Design a protein around this motif. Structure first.
Motif, PDB file in Angstrom:
ATOM      1  N   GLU A 179       3.297  -0.562   5.199  1.00  0.00           N
ATOM      2  CA  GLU A 179       1.569  -0.275   4.739  1.00  0.00           C
ATOM      3  C   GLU A 179       1.788   0.242   3.179  1.00  0.00           C
ATOM      4  N   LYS A 180       2.529   1.497   3.233  1.00  0.00           N
ATOM      5  CA  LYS A 180       2.860   2.271   1.871  1.00  0.00           C
ATOM      6  C   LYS A 180       3.464   1.281   0.882  1.00  0.00           C
ATOM      7  N   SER A 183       1.136  -1.523   0.087  1.00  0.00           N
ATOM      8  CA  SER A 183      -0.211  -1.420  -0.814  1.00  0.00           C
ATOM      9  C   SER A 183       0.280  -1.119  -2.413  1.00  0.00           C
ATOM     10  N   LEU A 243       9.074   7.235  -2.563  1.00  0.00           N
ATOM     11  CA  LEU A 243       8.820   6.246  -1.645  1.00  0.00           C
ATOM     12  C   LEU A 243       9.961   5.581  -1.104  1.00  0.00           C
TER      13      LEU A 243
END
Length: 247
Positions: A179-180, A183, A243
């Protein structure tokens, strides 16, 4: 004969972008020294992009990569035969050489981020190279001949396949990464979509219809170039640091 050529505000803007591109290249390098060499792929690609744009804006800033285009403008009349005027407009073909280097590398950045395969990254770059190549043909196509808007339209269609490929295949591949990451890819991807879409618009207003002067053209490309290379890169490289899903 009227001339359309750089003015003072245009000349200064070229120097501004040249300096902004060097600074971004320095900041990105400074970021890259905070991490091991084996994990610097994005910083290397993104720093080459801004360095190339620096080399390009330096060349245009000192008057290189520019050609004078002669344009004859036929006016229709009621009772009289058609009259003609001659315009000489600078065309900055240095941009098509820059874009041939930086847009594939930008697309490498996004494809690596999404996890696209090498074959799919390669496909986006073929379509992208057809876009900037036929863009260059259109830039030198004679007004009133099919080659000007015809090559433009071909470039727009190659551009549409870029978008289509990255949305579908970049989008499906970013899903698999969580998801990170997904997105982030969608947000920077959508940013890119909007920015790149403005380039054929500037072209239509500039090369196409000549509704803006050379100064106006230069300032528009300057905004987009800075947003598409400097800000884009600062967003990707800072987010990457936080990230591990991007690695």
């Amino acid at each position: 004969p009227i001339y359309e050529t750089v003015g003072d505000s245009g000349s200064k803007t070229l120097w501004v972008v040249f300096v902004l591109m060097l600074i971004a290249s320095a900041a990105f390098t400074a970021l890259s020294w905070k991490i091991p060499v084996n994990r610097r792929l994005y910083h290397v690609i993104t720093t080459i992009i801004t360095l190339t744009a620096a080399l390009s804006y330096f060349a245009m800033a000192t008057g290189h990569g520019v050609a004078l285009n002669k344009i004859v403008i036929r006016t229709q009349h009621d009772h009289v035969p058609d009259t003609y005027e001659t315009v000489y407009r600078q065309v900055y073909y240095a941009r098509y050489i820059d874009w041939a280097i930086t847009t594939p590398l930008l697309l490498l950045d996004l494809g690596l981020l999404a996890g696209m395969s090498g074959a799919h990254i390669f496909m986006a770059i073929v379509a992208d190279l057809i876009m900037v190549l036929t863009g260059l043909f259109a830039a030198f196509g004679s007004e009133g001949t099919p080659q000007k808007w015809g090559w433009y339209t071909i470039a727009c269609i190659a551009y549409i396949f870029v978008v289509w490929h990255l949305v579908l295949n970049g989008g499906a591949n970013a899903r698999v990464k969580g998801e990170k990451l997904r997105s982030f890819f969608v947000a920077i991807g959508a940013y890119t979509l909007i920015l790149w879409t403005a380039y054929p618009i500037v072209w239509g207003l500039a090369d196409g219809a000549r509704k803006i002067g050379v100064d106006g053209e230069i300032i528009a490309y300057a905004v987009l170039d800075v947003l598409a290379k400097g800000v884009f890169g600062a967003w990707l490289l800072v987010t990457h640091a936080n990230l591990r899903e991007s690695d």
